[PDB]
Amino acid sequence: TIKNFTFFSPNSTEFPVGSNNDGKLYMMLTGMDYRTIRRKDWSSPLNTALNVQYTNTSIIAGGRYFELLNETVALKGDSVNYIHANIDLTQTANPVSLSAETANNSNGVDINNGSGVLKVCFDIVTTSGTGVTSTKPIVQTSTLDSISVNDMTVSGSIDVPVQTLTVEAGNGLQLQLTKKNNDLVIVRFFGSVSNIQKGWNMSGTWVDRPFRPAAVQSLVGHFAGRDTSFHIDINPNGSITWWGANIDKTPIATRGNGSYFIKSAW
Amino acid sequence: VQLQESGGGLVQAGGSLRLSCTASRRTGSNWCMGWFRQLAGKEPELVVALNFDYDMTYYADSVKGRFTVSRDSGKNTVYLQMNSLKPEDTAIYYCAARSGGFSSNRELYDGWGQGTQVTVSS
Amino acid sequence: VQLQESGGGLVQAGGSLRLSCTASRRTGSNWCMGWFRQLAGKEPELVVALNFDYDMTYYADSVKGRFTVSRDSGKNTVYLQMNSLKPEDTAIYYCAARSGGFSSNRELYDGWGQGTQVTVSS
Amino acid sequence: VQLQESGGGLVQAGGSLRLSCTASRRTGSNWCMGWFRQLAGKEPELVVALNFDYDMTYYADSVKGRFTVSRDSGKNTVYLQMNSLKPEDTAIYYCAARSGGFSSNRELYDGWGQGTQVTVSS
Amino acid sequence: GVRQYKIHTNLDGTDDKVWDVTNGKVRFYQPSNLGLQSTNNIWQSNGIGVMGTRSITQPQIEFKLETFGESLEENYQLMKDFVNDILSKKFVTLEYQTEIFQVYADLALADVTKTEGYGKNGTFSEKITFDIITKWYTYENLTFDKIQNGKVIAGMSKIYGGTAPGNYKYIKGTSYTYYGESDIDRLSRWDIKEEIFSFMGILYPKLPKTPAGVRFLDDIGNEYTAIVFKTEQVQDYILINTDVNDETYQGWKGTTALNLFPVMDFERYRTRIIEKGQMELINLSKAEFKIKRKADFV
Amino acid sequence: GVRQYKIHTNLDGTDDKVWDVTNGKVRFYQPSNLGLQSTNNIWQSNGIGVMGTRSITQPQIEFKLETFGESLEENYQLMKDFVNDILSKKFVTLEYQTEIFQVYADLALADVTKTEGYGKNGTFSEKITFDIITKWYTYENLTFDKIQNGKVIAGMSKIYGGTAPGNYKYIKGTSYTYYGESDIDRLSRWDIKEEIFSFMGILYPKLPKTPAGVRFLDDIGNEYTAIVFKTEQVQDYILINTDVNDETYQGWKGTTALNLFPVMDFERYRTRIIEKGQMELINLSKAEFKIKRKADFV
């Protein structure tokens, strides 16, 4: 069965919109789950003794919009009070209430599809024995799929995927590759090189396909405790070419960080 | 990855001869073009090679200062100018080409030729 | 962190002695295990040390060619085999371990030993 | 191959000091186990050696009738009893093992030890 | 971090006496087996297994019972009080708490030893064995309310009515209201997803001269069992308890209780075995349940 | 190189959860017995044995169950999850893999212990016993196609005909063709040389009213059983599963499924114990079988 809402009801009986249907619609538009909120203090809450007065705060919890207009919440002294919005749809006249609790007791209850009381923490209010010392809001989470954006400003951090690979390149050379965002690679050299000539392909393992660059990458390395250096070429085909001077039977410790991009302009 | 093996035949000991090789395509970076030598039914071995991208040559100690490898424009053609020839040098010279620098291993070569026979008369 | 010393004792001038030291864990990169010594009521000096990550040794000029530092492979154990033992080398050898390479500063060492006494007669 | 070197030290005008060497494995036929002494002002010398497969010993003229090489019957261990030590014999003796008989070249030996300092006192 | 055991003389009763058998003066050590056994009545016909009915057996729990009194008198008193506290109830409840669960087992004493081979201060080292009644449960409190949607009123309700393509308006104080919720009925229902031992409930009938109770529907929405009553007089509420050992169907009118069992629809009460699906109310304004959730292994 | 055990909650199923009981945080060690027992109902007449029917008995498998969690919490979680994953299915499948075989056993939990006698990090060391349902099987996929030989045509077919000593000829584009094959019927038959626990089949009927299915013949060529259906309309295909614990007989026409039980020949379906001999098709153009092969010992 298909239940339609944002459509013409010719007889004003067909597609009435329920509060839970708008709740789900709003949750979907903003990308919120039952474990977060949308919250805005239009005016600052006021702290008086062991109380927080929400002067004009709007909240969206489980896609349900409500306003706190001079609504006071009594607090526990010398405590971290977790302020919750509680939604009980069976309390038809007053479905929303606020509580100050000892822990974040957000329960993720699906009030739009099932029974139960939704509890969602939106504020953290710390008190002394006499009043409020600090207030910190709960993070408003946006769960999104694919974003097309022109410009972005990040005040915190972006967490991108990370892949690692250790290559025993041969001749005693070891590469430890870290790839981030599937593009930027930082190669850390380890081991000690011996029995190699300039221009020669190293005798060991070739770089795995996911770490291979589109174009040849020359990575500069250094010989530990010396004023001498080398470079290796990571070829698009996966092979590694030695471009330092010829090395004899005695291995010299190889170290250093080199970076490259896997992707070119495309 | 096809190969052409122009030049090669009969000449006297202490004389001079040449070898030509052209590859259809290049498999990637660190493009090395050269020749593998096979004397008296023994195992084939790389003797002369040129790193195209680096303009760096490799010659085995046994042929040093006697042989000279050259490149023709951007035609991906390699020439071996063999002067002061020896009877030991009588071998079957196959043309080898690869991406990834110089290597002793046969399998690592993307292009392998038919093989032109060198006969140094006495 | 915690260190477990061994060896020491008496031996005559020109003789040989061996020291053993085991660390419970590694504090990090540039992991160095060595010994410090206080000779004739003077300031301690880093006599010997070994960088595990780089397989690089340090020997003070006074003990060069006589004292040899070895590691017990996979285990975090360091041995000091000293030859040509002289009465000036009569001191209490303290085993030291740290992350960050060689250092003359005692404070910078994450692991410090109880001390093993080496005594040599004239 | 890994050699487990044991014993050495210093002794007065010659005589007994303990000397032992054990090889982890055998590299092949004509299996030898012996000692090499490095000389400062001279060159590294092939002092003593023993062919396990032939029960034949080699002693350098300088140590003849003084030094005696013995083998453990069932354990692939070689012992050196060095008596009447002269100040000329002051050196560190590195245990060596190989397949292919006796050889002067240190690079042909498959197994090479850390060495044992032996100092003669006059 | 470490596991905690407690013996309750009346879990959830105001007169509950709790013996901390992990940290108190009377302790339990080394449960014989908190595991289980199963049978599928398999018959092999030349290696080929023919499966029958599956049945679980919960083994008895034997514990080492040790006392920590500081004198002979205290140790005799601790043994006497602990055992007689168990003996004074129809059953006792073991609380089993870890970092991952807090579960209960209704037990009945099977045996207890009493000897004289005392350690310092006359401490006891005995064996206690319990027969299992209900092994591994928790209580879940659920309220079901029969809420009815409002009517859809053109000019008030949020609906796109009128001339095509339809509309609503914002009108101060009358504007738009939400008529109701889609499936408002879900608030009067139990969505059964797990195994239970039994349940207990307080039912509030709605209409007089009409049978009241609850019905159970399977995953395909078909009724398979129901506890329904038809009383001569209106009852303030009806109390039900499907616990095999404390089974109750009683109506309350003021402070007077009446056995309603003779007045139940026996044909509709097919089984007490609650399947996955849902429970609906029958002529009730509200129902308050205390469900005894089940876990054979924890 | 070393042997591997895995517990599958649903082998060949889309919701299969695999516990690696060789390399995982939950491991099995020391199977009590992977062997068997046999009886030939021998009775002795003054030492002389008189043989009867041969029968195999597969013993229960008891394993040492070990957890490798790094904390009490992890170990409790591991035990609870592993046991309840087994307990949530009608049966579970043990995979037994070596360099020479990869075999399965359908098992039902018989018992599991849970104690408190912890090693480092509160790791478990318990005993788990399984009852055998189907011990040691593999799946074999076979296709049967009803192919008919062509006719023998003088001038076309390879045959030494005509005047003595007979001949054939090479004639451009008509030359010689092979009439058929000796025993072409072999391609539409199962030559049964081994023991089977059961089979799954997709049958493709040809003609409308005539019964359709398969028949089984013994080593002397006699029909002893047959699974056959007489449907009003030709089904696109029929699904059969002969497994004693999960049998099915379902026909498909378009997107419509039909239970074939009412239309099955209850007289001809004498046995599900398939003997050595051969299976022939009945009014089928093709059949695709997934045979559950039987190996008493591996």
Cβ atoms of F27 and F36 closer than 8 Å: no
Q: CA A24, CA A64: separation in Å to the nearest integer? A: 9
Tell me how close the Cα of A73 comes to any Cα of chain E, in angstroms: 26
Q: CA D113, CA D6: separation in Å to the nearest integer? A: 10
Interface test with D, best of C11, C16, C69, C80 (most D CBs within 10 A): C16
Cβ atoms of E187 and E220 closer than 8 Å: no
Using a CB–CB cut-off of 8 Å, the residues of C that contact D are: 14-16, 70, 83-84
The minimal CB distance from F55 to the residues E34, E39, E46 is found for: E46
DSSP state of F161: B
Q: CA C71, CA C81: separation in Å to the nearest integer? A: 11
SS3 B60: coil
Residues sharing a CB contact under 8 Å with residue C26, sequence separation 6 or more, in sequence order: C52, C76, C99
How many other C-beta atoms lie within 10 A of the C-beta of residue F36?
Answer: 15
Q: Which residues from C are below 8 Å from D119, CB to CB?
A: 14, 83-84
Cα E12 to chain centroid, rounded: 12
- The residue type at E4: Q
SS3 C113: coil
Same domain, F123 and F5: yes
What does the block give as tokens for F256? 């419509």
Tell me if B29 and A235 make a contact (CB, 8 A cut-off): yes
C-alpha closest to that of F59 among F90, F85, F31: F31
Beta bridge partners of D116: D93
CA F105 → CA B100, E274, F58, distances in Å?
A: 51, 32, 11
Question: Any CB–CB contact under 8 A between C29 and chain A?
Answer: no
Beta bridge partners of B57: B50
Q: CA E12, CA E139: separation in Å to the nearest integer? A: 10
Cβ atoms of B23 and B2 closer than 8 Å: yes
C-alpha closest to that of F278 among F200, F217, F196: F217
- The residue type at F222: N
- The residue type at A210: P
Residues in chain F: 298
Tell me how close the Cα of E237 comes to any Cα of chain F, in angstroms: 38
Q: CA F145, CA E211: separation in Å to the nearest integer? A: 64
Q: CA E88, CA E90: separation in Å to the nearest integer? A: 7
Cβ atoms of C99 and C29 closer than 8 Å: yes
DSSP state of E58: P
Same domain, E122 and E233: no
Strand D31-37 and strand D45-51: pairing? antiparallel
Task: Please report, in angstroms and rounded to a whole number, the separation of the first and last CA atoms in chain F.
Answer: 17
Q: Which residues from E are below 8 Å from F90, CB to CB?
A: 51, 54
What does the block give as tokens for F144? 């049967």
Q: CA E218, CA E224: separation in Å to the nearest integer? A: 7
What does the block give as tokens for E291? 């469900």
Question: Any CB–CB contact under 8 A between B72 and chain A?
Answer: no
CA D69 → CA D38, D57, D87, E276, distances in Å?
A: 19, 7, 20, 87
Q: CA D14, CA D82: separation in Å to the nearest integer? A: 8
Tell me if E182 and A7 make a contact (CB, 8 A cut-off): no
Same domain, F53 and F103: no
SS3 F52: coil
Cβ atoms of A60 and A30 closer than 8 Å: yes
Same domain, E22 and E123: yes
Tell me if D8 and C14 make a contact (CB, 8 A cut-off): no
Q: Which residues from F are below 8 Å from E47, CB to CB?
A: 36, 56-58, 132, 135, 294, 296
Same domain, F214 and F108: no
The minimal CB distance from A13 to the residues E152, E178, E183 is found for: E152
Structural domains for chain A? 18-138 (2.60.520.10), 161-263 (2.60.40.1830)
Task: Please report, in angstroms and rounded to a whole number, the separation of the first and last CA atoms in chain D.
Answer: 37
Residues sharing a CB contact under 8 Å with residue E166, sequence separation 6 or more, in sequence order: A7, A8, A9, A10, E159, E160
CATH number for position E163: 2.10.25.60
Task: Identify the experimental approach.
Answer: X-ray
DSSP state of F61: E
How many other C-beta atoms lie within 10 A of the C-beta of residue F146?
Answer: 18
Q: CA E280, CA F231: separation in Å to the nearest integer? A: 42
Residue matched to tokens 């059964």: E192
Cβ atoms of A189 and A221 closer than 8 Å: yes
Angle at B104 between CA B101 and CA B107, to 5 degrees: 85
Chains that touch A (3 or more CB pairs under 8 A): B, C, E
Cβ atoms of A20 and A116 closer than 8 Å: no
CATH number for position F190: 2.60.120.880
DSSP chain A: -----SSB-TTSSSSPPPHHHHHHHHHHHHT--TT--EEEEEE--EE-SSEEEESEEEEEETTEEEEESSEEEE--TTSEEEEEEEE-TTSTT--EEEEEESS-------TTTS-S-EEEEEEEEEE-SSSEEEEEEPP-----S----S----SS-----EEEEEEEEETTEEEEEEEETTTEEEEEEEEEE-SB-TTBBPSSPPPPGGG--SS-EEEEEEETTSS-EEEEEE-TTS-EEE-S--B-SS-EEEEEEEEEES----
Tell me if A16 and E159 make a contact (CB, 8 A cut-off): yes
Name the residue ranges covered by the structural domains of chain C.
Answer: 1-122
Structural domain boundaries enclosing F161: 148-180
Q: Which residues from A are below 8 Å from E182, CB to CB?
A: 3, 18, 20-21
What does the block give as tokens for D69? 């090489």
CA F13 → CA B75, F16, F20, distances in Å?
A: 59, 6, 17
Beta-strand (E) ranges in chain C? 3-7, 9-12, 16-23, 31-39, 45-51, 56-59, 67-71, 77-83, 91-99, 111-112, 116-121
**Count H helices, E strands: chain D?**
0, 11
D87: left (phi over 0), alpha (psi -120 to 50) or beta: alpha
Tell me how close the Cα of E196 comes to any Cα of chain F, in angstroms: 15
Residue matched to tokens 């001569």: E232
DSSP D12-67: ESS-----EEEESS--SSSEEEEEEE--SSS--EEEEEEETTTTEEEE-GGGTTTE
Q: CA D101, CA D54: separation in Å to the nearest integer? A: 10
CB-based touch F/A (3+ pairs, under 8 A): no
Tell me how close the Cα of E59 comes to any Cα of chain F, in angstroms: 10
SS3 E298: coil
Q: CA F3, CA F184: separation in Å to the nearest integer? A: 43
What does the block give as tokens for A20? 């839970």
Same domain, E22 and E89: yes
- The residue type at E217: L
Q: CA F280, CA E134: separation in Å to the nearest integer? A: 56
- The residue type at D35: W
Tell me if E152 and A16 make a contact (CB, 8 A cut-off): yes
Same domain, F79 and F197: no
Cβ atoms of C82 and C16 closer than 8 Å: yes
Quick one: closest CA in F to E62, which residue?
A: F115
Same domain, E43 and E77: no
Tell me how close the Cα of D9 comes to any Cα of chain C, in angstroms: 6
Chains that touch F (3 or more CB pairs under 8 A): E
SS3 E189: coil
What does the block give as tokens for E233? 């007089």
Q: CA A226, CA C54: separation in Å to the nearest integer? A: 13
Residues sharing a CB contact under 8 Å with residue E71, sequence separation 6 or more, in sequence order: E121, E122
CB-based touch F/D (3+ pairs, under 8 A): no
SS3 F185: helix
Same domain, E199 and E159: no
C-alpha closest to that of B84 among B69, B71, B65, B70: B65
Q: Which residues from B are below 8 Å from A198, CB to CB?
A: 56
Task: Please report, in angstroms and rounded to a whole number, the separation of the first and last CA atoms in chain E.
Answer: 17
Quick one: closest CA in A to B54, which residue?
A: A199
Full 3-state SS string of E151-183: CCCCCCECCEECCCCCECCCCCCCCCECCCCCC
Domain count, chain E: 4
How many other C-beta atoms lie within 10 A of the C-beta of residue C1?
Answer: 11
What dotted CATH number matches C1-122?
A: 2.60.40.10
Cβ atoms of B62 and B75 closer than 8 Å: no
Q: CA B47, CA B51: separation in Å to the nearest integer? A: 14
Q: CA A251, CA A261: separation in Å to the nearest integer? A: 30
Interface A-C: count of C-beta contacts within 8 A: 8
Residues sharing a CB contact under 8 Å with residue A171, sequence separation 6 or more, in sequence order: A193, A194, A195, A196, A202, A203, A204, A242, A247
Angle at B58 between CA B56 and CA B64, to 5 degrees: 125
Q: CA A86, CA A84: separation in Å to the nearest integer? A: 6
Quick one: closest CA in C to D117, which residue?
A: C83
Chains that touch D (3 or more CB pairs under 8 A): C
C-alpha closest to that of D5 among D110, D111, D116: D116
Strand A162-170 and strand A173-180: pairing? antiparallel
CA C53 → CA A194, A219, A254, B87, C101, distances in Å?
A: 17, 22, 11, 52, 10
CATH number for position E47: 6.20.370.40
Tell me if B29 and A197 make a contact (CB, 8 A cut-off): no
Tell me if E298 and F80 make a contact (CB, 8 A cut-off): yes
Q: CA E182, CA E180: separation in Å to the nearest integer? A: 7
Residues sharing a CB contact under 8 Å with residue F69, sequence separation 6 or more, in sequence order: F25, F75, F76, F77, F78, F121, F122, F123
DSSP state of B29: S
Beta bridge partners of F258: F251
DSSP state of F24: S
Beta-strand (E) ranges in F76-154? 92-97, 102-112, 125-145
Q: CA C22, CA E147: separation in Å to the nearest integer? A: 74
Q: CA B111, CA B52: separation in Å to the nearest integer? A: 15
Cβ atoms of C70 and C35 closer than 8 Å: no
DSSP E60-111: PEEEEEEE--SSHHHHHHHHHHHHHHHHTSS-EEEEEE-SS-EEEEEEEEEE
Element (H, E) at E216: strand E212-218
Q: CA F78, CA F52: separation in Å to the nearest integer? A: 48
Same domain, F143 and F287: yes
Task: Please report, in angstroms and rounded to a whole number, the separation of the first and last CA atoms in chain C.
Answer: 37
Angle at A87 between CA A82 and CA A90, to 5 degrees: 145
Cα D42 to chain centroid, rounded: 18
Tell me if C84 and D9 make a contact (CB, 8 A cut-off): no
Full 3-state SS string of A34-99: CCCCEEEEEECCEECCCEEEECEEEEEECCEEEEECCEEEECCCCCEEEEEEEECCCCCCCCEEEE
**Which pairs count as long-range contacts for F73-76, CB under 8 Å and 24+ apart, including other chains?**
F73/E98, F73/E99, F73/E100, F74/F25, F74/F121, F75/F121, F75/F122, F75/F123, F75/F124, F76/E98, F76/E99, F76/E100, F76/E101, F76/F122
Cβ atoms of A200 and B102 closer than 8 Å: yes
- The residue type at D42: K
Q: CA E127, CA E114: separation in Å to the nearest integer? A: 8
Same domain, F101 and F162: no
Cβ atoms of A118 and A132 closer than 8 Å: no
Task: Give just the sign of the alpha carbon dihedral E26, E32, E33, E38.
Answer: negative
Q: Which residues from D are below 8 Å from C83, CB to CB?
A: 117, 119
Tell me how close the Cα of E203 comes to any Cα of chain A, in angstroms: 17
SS3 F78: helix
Half-sphere exposure in the Cβ direction for E64 (13 Å, CA): 7
Q: CA D51, CA D29: separation in Å to the nearest integer? A: 9
